[PDB]
């Protein structure tokens, strides 16, 4: 139950994480996570129902989705937990994240195909099945479509925002949630998707296993925000059309509310918070 910085994982931890991810892919379970995420990416809208993102429930929804995935990993190997990627610290293609013993590196220039690491198409172990175009191989272009990952100063500026979220509770909002998501401001989470490129920049972004580590770090930043702002909490708190209020349940689970997910320590802790 401890989520660790990827940069600190041992060789055995890396190996067991990769093996569990690959078993989920083999059994067909992984691709259903891709498909769930894509459904919400394509259906959430700023002027209509919005649950998985561009909305206050962006953060509890991804927290619960990551718990579903981690629980699936643990069903294969109970020692495995989701590591997190601090992209403000590990910010170049030279980071061990991108080594062949972990996620593999960037894609080749010709077609963006990842050529090394456990998830390279040549291994036979990582077919891209849930997809929006004919290509069936993992692709990346690290630093191709945006120069820089967010910096620590930029992150600190977003953590400083006291309000969790604000009307109209969508991609035009001021407040912490939308600045962390990145639709307004210096842009944290959206820009990381763009920086990785390939399937991470698309509506089928969990096809790249880095998805999970990115979101585990976004989730940590929510937890860090909570500690900075003990007097701030999830909003809205009742009666908002199209938006998940604090005590309302969330699709697809229908049985959990943002309220049930505000305190991560009920499920895991971090190596350092």
């Amino acid at each position: 139950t401890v989520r660790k910085n990827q940069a600190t994982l041992t060789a055995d931890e890396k190996r067991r994480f990769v093996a569990a991810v690959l078993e989920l892919k083999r059994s067909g379970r992984y691709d259903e996570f891709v498909r769930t995420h894509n459904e919400f990416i394509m259906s959430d809208t700023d002027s209509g129902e919005r649950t998985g993102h561009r909305s206050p429930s962006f953060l509890p929804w991804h927290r619960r989705f990551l718990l579903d995935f981690e629980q699936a990993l643990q069903s294969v190997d109970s020692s495995v937990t989701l590591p997190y990627w601090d992209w403000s610290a590990d910010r170049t293609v030279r980071a061990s994240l991108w080594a062949p013993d972990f996620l593999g590196g960037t894609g080749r220039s010709t077609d963006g195909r990842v050529m090394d690491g456990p998830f390279a198409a040549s291994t036979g172990n990582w077919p891209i099945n849930v997809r929006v175009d004919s290509r069936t191989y993992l692709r990346r272009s690290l630093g191709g479509s945006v120069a820089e990952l967010p910096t620590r100063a930029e992150v600190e500026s977003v953590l400083a925002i006291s309000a969790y979220d604000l009307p109209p509770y969508n991609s035009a909002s001021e407040g912490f949630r939308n600045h962390l998501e990145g639709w307004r401001g210096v842009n944290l989470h959206n820009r990381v998707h763009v920086w990785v490129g390939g399937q991470m920049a698309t509506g089928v972004s969990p096809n790249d296993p880095v998805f999970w580590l990115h979101h585990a770090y976004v989730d940590k930043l929510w937890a860090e925000w909570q500690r900075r702002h003990p007097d701030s909490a999830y909003v809205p708190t009742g009666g908002t059309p199209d938006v998940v209020d604090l005590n309302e349940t969330m699709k697809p689970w229908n049985t959990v509310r943002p309220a049930d997910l505000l305190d991560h320590t009920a499920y895991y802790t971090f190596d350092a918070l």
């Binding site: 894509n38 394509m42 209509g48 997809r131 175009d133 004919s134 969508n170 990145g182």
Partner: protein
């Protein structure tokens, strides 16, 4: 009030747009005659399912960014 329609050849592919497990959008885009899911954000910018996190000003910009992303690959119907 939706954007105007468009039709052009961009990097050898036909891109078209027109006012009209996925969303309600008042506007449709096609790449070589295959529909590309696109979406408008509250500030008027656009994204698509092949470039979802990088808002661009117009639906034609979204179609062109999709062609750039695809690197010649056929789009699959959504």
């Amino acid at each position: 009030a939706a954007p105007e329609s468009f039709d052009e050849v961009y990097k050898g592919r036909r891109i078209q747009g027109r006012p009209a497990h996925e969303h309600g959008g008042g506007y449709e885009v096609f790449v070589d005659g295959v529909q590309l899911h696109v979406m408008r954000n509250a500030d008027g910018s656009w994204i698509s399912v092949v470039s979802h996190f990088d808002p661009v000003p117009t639906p034609r910009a979204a179609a062109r960014a999709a062609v750039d992303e695809l690197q010649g690959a056929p789009l699959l119907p959504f």
